[PDB]
């Protein structure tokens, strides 16, 4: 169902916030509608609005974690 899909697994974006500590990893989808998918630490996928300030903080927080070479994906 929602397990695998790729491309754009979802078309709706969450504008409301999630704790940035629940961010597992993100994937930005590029096209005409850009959506950033965040996986939560529970292992579920969430889709978030990339122009949300909190999203920008987290999508960039994970981006910042990608500057240094140590990515604990667990």
C-alpha positions as a Markdown table, in Angstrom:
| # | Residue | x | y | z |
|---|---|---|---|---|
| 1 | Unk | 0.0 | 0.0 | 0.0 |
| 2 | Unk | 2.0 | 2.9 | 1.3 |
| 3 | Unk | 5.1 | 0.7 | 2.0 |
| 4 | Unk | 6.7 | 1.3 | -1.3 |
| 5 | Unk | 5.7 | 3.5 | -4.2 |
| 6 | Unk | 8.4 | 6.0 | -5.1 |
| 7 | Unk | 8.1 | 9.0 | -7.4 |
| 8 | Unk | 5.3 | 10.6 | -5.3 |
| 9 | Unk | 4.0 | 8.2 | -2.7 |
| 10 | Unk | 1.6 | 11.0 | -1.5 |
| 11 | Unk | 0.2 | 14.2 | -2.9 |
| 12 | Unk | -1.1 | 15.7 | 0.3 |
| 13 | Unk | 1.2 | 17.6 | 2.6 |
| 14 | Unk | 1.0 | 18.1 | 6.3 |
| 15 | Unk | 1.2 | 21.8 | 7.2 |
| 16 | Unk | 0.9 | 21.0 | 11.0 |
| 17 | Unk | 4.0 | 20.3 | 13.0 |
| 18 | Unk | 5.7 | 17.2 | 14.2 |
| 19 | Unk | 8.6 | 17.1 | 16.7 |
| 20 | Unk | 11.8 | 17.4 | 14.9 |
| 21 | Unk | 13.1 | 14.6 | 17.1 |
| 22 | Unk | 10.7 | 12.3 | 15.4 |
| 23 | Unk | 12.2 | 12.9 | 12.0 |
| 24 | Unk | 13.8 | 9.7 | 10.9 |
| 25 | Unk | 14.9 | 10.8 | 7.4 |
| 26 | Unk | 13.4 | 12.8 | 4.6 |
| 27 | Unk | 13.0 | 12.6 | 0.8 |
| 28 | Unk | 12.1 | 15.6 | -1.3 |
| 29 | Unk | 10.1 | 15.0 | -4.4 |
| 30 | Unk | 10.7 | 17.2 | -7.3 |
| 31 | Unk | 8.3 | 18.0 | -10.0 |
| 32 | Unk | 5.6 | 20.6 | -10.3 |
| 33 | Unk | 4.4 | 19.9 | -6.8 |
| 34 | Unk | 7.3 | 19.6 | -4.5 |
| 35 | Unk | 6.7 | 17.7 | -1.3 |
| 36 | Unk | 9.1 | 16.6 | 1.3 |
| 37 | Unk | 8.4 | 13.2 | 2.8 |
| 38 | Unk | 9.5 | 12.6 | 6.3 |
| 39 | Unk | 9.7 | 9.3 | 7.8 |
| 40 | Unk | 8.9 | 9.3 | 11.4 |
| 41 | Unk | 10.9 | 7.4 | 14.0 |
| 42 | Unk | 7.9 | 5.0 | 14.2 |
| 43 | Unk | 8.8 | 4.0 | 10.7 |
| 44 | Unk | 5.8 | 5.6 | 9.1 |
| 45 | Unk | 5.9 | 8.0 | 6.3 |
| 46 | Unk | 4.7 | 11.5 | 6.7 |
| 47 | Unk | 4.4 | 14.1 | 3.9 |
| 48 | Unk | 5.2 | 17.6 | 4.8 |
| 49 | Unk | 5.0 | 21.1 | 3.3 |
| 50 | Unk | 8.6 | 22.2 | 2.2 |
| 51 | Unk | 7.9 | 25.8 | 2.7 |
| 52 | Unk | 6.9 | 25.3 | 6.3 |
| 53 | Unk | 9.4 | 26.9 | 8.6 |
| 54 | Unk | 9.6 | 24.0 | 10.9 |
| 55 | Unk | 10.1 | 21.7 | 7.9 |
| 56 | Unk | 12.9 | 23.8 | 6.7 |
| 57 | Unk | 14.4 | 23.5 | 10.1 |
| 58 | Unk | 14.2 | 19.7 | 10.0 |
| 59 | Unk | 14.9 | 19.0 | 6.4 |
| 60 | Unk | 17.9 | 21.1 | 6.9 |
| 61 | Unk | 18.7 | 19.6 | 10.3 |
| 62 | Unk | 19.0 | 16.2 | 8.5 |
| 63 | Unk | 20.8 | 18.0 | 5.7 |
| 64 | Unk | 23.2 | 19.2 | 8.4 |
| 65 | Unk | 23.6 | 15.7 | 9.6 |
| 66 | Unk | 24.6 | 14.8 | 6.1 |
| 67 | Unk | 27.5 | 17.3 | 6.2 |
| 68 | Unk | 29.3 | 15.1 | 8.7 |
| 69 | Unk | 30.0 | 11.5 | 7.8 |
| 70 | Unk | 28.0 | 9.5 | 10.3 |
| 71 | Unk | 24.5 | 8.7 | 9.6 |
| 72 | Unk | 22.9 | 6.4 | 12.0 |
| 73 | Unk | 20.0 | 4.8 | 10.1 |
| 74 | Unk | 18.3 | 2.6 | 12.6 |
